[PDB]
Design a protein around this ligand. Structure first.
Ligand SMILES: N#Cc1c2c(c3nncn3c1NCc1ccco1)CN(Cc1ccccc1)CC2
Lengths: 29, 355
């Protein structure tokens, strides 16, 4: 489907961003 | 709707001036407290979320210019120190980089020849700041080298005030929108733009900014009036005007690939609308959670709408408190989606915790 193929792209790309966030250690405010 | 929230707290800021923007810091690591910033009038205020709905005031930045009106803020981090950073801008058209630890302005950029409506940081490169202005242009800045990388405007740029923009998830392209009713696509993964970003890094003390006069796609066929908020939803676009609906659409025909779309592409595919009511005044923004499973929008009478995006008919939760009656300008979810904060025109802040 249009929305189902679009959801898979969101899942794959947000996973990439989440892995990059996980690899970081940003100091608290 | 499967999503449920409880209103656990609210407060009104001392100054009583309207609040226009709110952003949780999605850069904070696990173990660190959840922090959000609010913007309104000449003030930027930081808050920390604690257990039992506690909203703890940290400190505020007050601009020496009593006539400054901040409309937007965006979080980043210093790639060298790992320390968080906060960019703010508004009516004066000046971009301020605030150190949130001390809430002081460390540096500023005379951004545009008019007010700034929105700031967004690139999702992969923390130094790339995008500003959108009433001067009809968008500007891309490199805050590590203090350079203006590119200006998106001119011959086929916006013909009126730019109100909003958004990078897609991997930061390869920007969709902008404004008072000219148009939505324009600007690719930043083009060989020209990737080279201009590389060059801004090579710069050391003037830098020659790229002047991008032509977008990669343009449409005036989604909305028949000003477009004041745009966000990517994967390869699809979510945008709104004053017609009490957020329209989900894509450039080209139903089957067309976003990366195969030619700049002369004449068609648009409208996939559906998220309908609501009492949100027909200008400058009302919608937001999504990090995983883009939830869509949120406040209206002019203090109702907060939340839709479940995991559909094909989308279920909607309406969040209301009898004491919340002012226009909700912007909402922000904490990174883990456990908290939703809404800010109002009457200087009130509302905390909704997910059940
Ligand atoms: N939010 C905001 C925002 C707002 C005003 C604005 N004017 N030019 C740009 N503007 C904004 N840009 C940010 C933006 C771009 C797209 C969406 O939001 C004027 N305000 C009028 C007002 C003042 C005091 C009390 C109630 C109402 C409302 C808020």
């Amino acid at each position: 489907s249009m929305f189902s193929s679009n959801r898979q792209k969101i899942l794959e790309r947000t996973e990439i961003l989440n892995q990059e966030w996980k690899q970081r250690r940003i100091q608290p405010v | 709707c499967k999503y449920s929230f409880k209103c656990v707290n609210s407060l009104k800021e001392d100054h009583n001036q309207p609040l226009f923007g709110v952003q949780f810091n999605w850069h904070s690591k696990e173990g660190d407290p959840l922090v959000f910033a609010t913007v309104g009038s000449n003030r930027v205020t930081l808050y920390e979320c604690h257990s039992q709905g506690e909203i703890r005031l940290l400190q505020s930045y007050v601009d020496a210019d009593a006539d400054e009106n901040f409309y937007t803020c965006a979080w980043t981090y210093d790639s060298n120190t790992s320390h968080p950073l906060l960019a703010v801008a508004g009516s004066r058209g000046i971009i301020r980089i605030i150190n949130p630890i001390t809430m002081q302005c460390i540096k500023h950029y005379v951004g545009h020849g008019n007010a700034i409506n929105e700031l967004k940081f690139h999702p992969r490169d923390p130094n790339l700041l995008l500003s959108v202005s009433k001067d009809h242009a968008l500007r891309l800045w490199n805050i590590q080298t203090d350079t203006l990388v590119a200006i998106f405007g001119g011959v086929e740029g916006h013909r009126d005030e730019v109100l909003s923009a958004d990078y897609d998830l991997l930061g390869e392209k920007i969709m902008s929108c404004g008072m000219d009713h148009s939505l324009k696509l600007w690719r930043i993964n083009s060989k020209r733009m990737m080279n201009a970003i590389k060059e801004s890094y090579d710069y050391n003390p003037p830098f020659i900014s790229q002047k991008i006069h032509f977008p990669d796609f343009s449409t005036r066929d989604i909305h028949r009036n000003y477009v004041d908020c745009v966000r990517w939803l994967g390869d699809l676009i979510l945008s709104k005007s004053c017609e009490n609906a957020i329209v989900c659409w894509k450039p080209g025909k139903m089957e067309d690939d976003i990366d195969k779309i030619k700049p002369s592409e004449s068609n648009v595919t409208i996939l559906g609308r998220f309908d609501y009511s009492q949100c027909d005044i200008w400058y009302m923004r919608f937001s999504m959670d990090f995983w883009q499973k939830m869509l949120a929008l406040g209206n002019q009478v203090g109702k907060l709408y939340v839709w479940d995006l995991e559909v094909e008919k989308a279920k909607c939760t309406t969040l209301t408190h009898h004491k919340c009656g002012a226009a909700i300008r912007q909402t922000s979810f904490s990174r883990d989606s456990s908290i939703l904060i809404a800010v109002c025109d009457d200087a009130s802040i509302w905390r909704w915790d997910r059940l």
